[PDB]
């Protein structure tokens, strides 16, 4: 009785951070020891549960949230963080019990001239609640004058493209992130 970890980490295409995808995993034995021992994963950090002592633990359900950001933003996928991703795209609660795994995906998600497939929310009037998912494309009204669906001064599109390039700095290269939560 194994798990779909194979098709979640080694998936062909990931989702944008603003439209983060969630896979549900309930009752299947897994070996998180081959992942902690892997140099492929640039980030393996767990909260509320030790990353070493992980295989013994048992919880009723496991959620696998996956998305793509850039390297400088991987520090925001943690409880009590602030920034573009944490405030407007993906917020982890303070009492989050799980792990955050990330690896550099430059060879897959970067294109010469810039990739147009991965977006991130740039404007929002209020911060996201923990595990909230916002995919609305409403024109952000930054001023008092109401936008009527048309962009302009103080009327901007809420989503922006990363424009991933292979020549970008490693801080700006694409990173695929997988967030495991245990309830």
């Amino acid at each position, epitope marked *: 009785n194994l798990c779909p970890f194979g098709e979640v980490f080694n998936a062909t295409r990931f989702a944008s951070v603003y439209a983060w995808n969630r896979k549900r995993i309930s009752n299947c034995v897994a070996d998180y020891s081959v992942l902690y021992n892997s140099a492929s994963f640039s980030t393996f950090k767990c909260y509320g549960v030790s990353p070493t002592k992980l295989n013994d633990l048992c919880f009723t359900n496991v959620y696998a949230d996956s998305f793509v950001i850039r390297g400088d933003e991987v520090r925001q996928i943690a409880p009590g963080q602030t920034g573009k991703i944490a405030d407007y795209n993906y917020k982890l609660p303070d009492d989050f019990t799980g792990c955050v795994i990330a690896w550099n995906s430059n060879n897959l998600d970067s294109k010469v001239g810039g990739n147009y497939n991965y977006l991130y929310r*740039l*404007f929002r*009037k209020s911060n996201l609640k923990p595990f909230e998912r916002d995919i609305s494309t409403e024109i952000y009204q*930054a*001023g*008092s*004058t109401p936008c009527n669906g048309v962009e*302009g*001064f*103080n009327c*901007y*599109f809420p989503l*922006q493209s990363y424009g991933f390039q292979p020549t970008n700095g490693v801080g700006y290269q694409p990173y695929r992130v997988v967030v495991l939560s245990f309830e």
Partner: antibody
Amino acid sequence: QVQLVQSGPEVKKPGTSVKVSCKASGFTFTTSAVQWVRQARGQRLEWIGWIVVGSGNTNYAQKFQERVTITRDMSTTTAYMELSSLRSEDTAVYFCAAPHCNSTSCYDAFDIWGQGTMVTVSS
Amino acid sequence: DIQMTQSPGTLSLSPGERATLSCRASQSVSSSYLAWYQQKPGQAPRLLIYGASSRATGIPDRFSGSGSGTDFTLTISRLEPEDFGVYYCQQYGSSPWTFGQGTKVEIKR
């Protein structure tokens, strides 16, 4: 101190390029926009273009589509204006302007203005 | 492009009179995307009125604004000596955000 400070005077030969800096202070740069306007000695105001600070998207005027590219750097809270292939006709004073904004909302006009940057182009 | 034309070219008025400046657009523009600026020699433009009829921060209440569509008006109820300079109107709704040619308010003598 809601400020907008620009570069010093520039004196370049014809055929070169000048890059004027414009640094913000007081308000949160990340959510505003910056337009560029030039004024020749004793002439009217000529709108060059504007940029959205958060996205970097640009709109230019027809007469500057060919030699002006507007950029910004949110780390150094500064916006730039690059002017390539200078000539005597480009000798003017250049202003940057921006609405002051907090973390979520903006002013409804260009109320913050820079001191102005004079660019002289001759041999 | 939307063309903005201003009148008069030179407004020769005595200190204490009521000044009136005009701003014309070649096509109907939004009232909430028009501004008035004041510029003194050797200085940067200073925002006076925006949204056609919204006084800016710190601008005295003798400055007023009106208009809609293609015709707009800047009214100074009582002209003060510190008000004699050049005034510009700019629309910032439809790109390019064109300016007017300016109106010089001089002291009549």
